[model samples]
Target: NLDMIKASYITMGYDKNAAEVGEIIKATVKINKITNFSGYQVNIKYDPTVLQAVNPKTGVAYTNSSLPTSGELLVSEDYGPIVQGVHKISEGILNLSRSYTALEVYRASESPEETGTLAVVGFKVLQKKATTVVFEDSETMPNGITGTTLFNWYGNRIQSGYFVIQPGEINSAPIATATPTTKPTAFAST
Candidate 1:
């Protein structure tokens, strides 16, 4: 009865809304729950007009002992049938969320479960407005029909990276009184 209660993915992490236009906003794909799995695949769809996805450090340093996978960079397809080995990050998307054949994580795993930064889908804020980063529907992982070997559907964090877009540089300088009183230290005190 309660099976439907769990949405495949949960969107989280929308800190303090608003990023300066052209600012690089960083966020992670924290997993929620899965009985047993190994990999994941999801489409992190952001508005191309607002933010552009770039520099995705996919399979980031996790609890697992460094996954020996293929192509940590984006894959060939823009938005098509993506295989399990390839990671995509181009134009305006960061997608791919599927776990390998089941591993219920009896212990803490650095893998694609229990909240690991699956991919650093860094977005360069392009415009200043109330923008959003979210996950949409896709045909991948934990398919109710064919199980096992197929990449499972899970990347942990259900939250999207939400924030306002601010301009790259300050539009105007502050008053003279706002100047810093102390010389900034740069680890050279020795």
Candidate 2:
């Protein structure tokens, strides 16, 4: 059973340049599997000097989707609204949490339950340059550091999530051109 739980590395998400400085951008964090577990929490790790999680103190981003299904990368993602999260401006983090349920019981299935968004955070670009937002990988969650920064329902970590900010395209201004006047109504329709 442990062998079945073994394998599969963690992964995370994002993009840049779509928005300008002072503009708000949404970023996502997801792992391979998000099912068969009751609850979990992850602290967002980001450069305080580069971007703001939409806050002055914690830099924690604002989230609308239930701590579970926001920036789900999967075109057909996982379950919905199972966890709750809170932010610590001083710590610059958002902590996600959930309780246990029988629904979490793992059953023998064919298709695998992998690739689901752990959470989505709203980021305000602070500069013209690029920046990144990642989930803190550790035992103590930072940003006031609370519960374990990692997760695993059956005493085994499934996988962790993390990502970088890729620079977007820089578009040039449009050029102005003058054109000759057209014929008078095609020569009065001949």
Candidate 3:
């Protein structure tokens, strides 16, 4: 059986909410048809007690509520209907969570602008490695709204490369190493 490869990354931006991130990721999956996968999963790392101020642009807080904005987004695919050979794509959102707060809802902005890199980051495979890679691009708006974005983002932004097991390799066991019989003597015995 073919094994599904999984990947993830931390979305760096303001007002990062799990539900909002999830929604964006789902939209990407729907457009891409990730295959046998129902939806994306996430573990948010924000605490409400810390309470940091919200970003003016994204309106996401910068502390407890803001940490999730910096946490990772996990992407998974199903291995059902196993087949030979690796399949890969190099464009589109990989994983995202939808918004769950009023601030997040407001931050969405609906400006016809693509905000996150999760989808685009999902498709980048670097040099036949099982990792995602990211590239950077920058543009300036008329009103001095300038920002740099990742162009070729890949492997959750943590790994540069990875390995995928082929169907034939699934049944093969890894080679075992033999243990030493005894400890080495400091000097020759008389």
Residue 53, candidate 1: Cα error in Å is: 1.0
Show model 1 residue runs off by greater than 4 Å: 1-9, 12-16, 56-91, 97-115, 139-190
What's the C-alpha lDDT at position 146 in model 1? 18
Poorest 10 consecutive residues by lDDT, candidate 3? 79-88
**For residue 104, what is the lDDT in candidate 2?**
32
Choose the strongest candidate by lDDT. 2
lDDT of 1 by residue, 1-190 (tens): 5224443433334323556876666554443353333444555456677765544355232221122223332221321223332333333544443333323331234433332234444556677755666554445533312111113324242233221121122122333575558887777555
How good is model 2 by TM-score? 0.50
TM-score for each predicted model, relative to the true structure: 0.44, 0.50, 0.17
Against the reference, the lDDT scores of all candidates come to 0.40, 0.46, 0.21
Worst 10 residues of 1 by lDDT: 162-171
Better of 1 and 2 by lDDT: 2
How do the residues 1-190 of candidate 2 rate in per-residue lDDT, one tens digit apiece? 4224444434444543355777766565555444443344665655555566653224555442224334433222132234576665455555655433322332222233455554555667766554545545444544322223333434343344422222222222235677868776634553
